[PDB]
């Protein structure tokens, strides 16, 4: 399903899709995962990441 995102750590393009490397709220860093942008409902975090980089 869906899980709370703490922060976006990094961004890449893979296979033509933008992916974001996510720290999940309440999970260790070992659980960080790359997710395609369409998996996120994180408009505030994405715009803050994309403006501060």
């Amino acid at each position: 399903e869906e899980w709370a995102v703490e922060k976006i750590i990094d961004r890449r393009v893979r296979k033509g899709m933008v992916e974001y490397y996510l720290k999940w709220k309440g999970y260790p860093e070992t659980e960080n995962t790359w997710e395609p942008e369409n998996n996120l409902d994180c408009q505030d975090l994405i715009q803050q990441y994309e403006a501060s980089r």
Binding site: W3, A4, L22, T33, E35, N39, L40, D41, C42
Partner: peptide, 6 residues
Amino acid sequence: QTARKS
């Protein structure tokens, strides 16, 4: 502020 996994 949520996301789907994989």
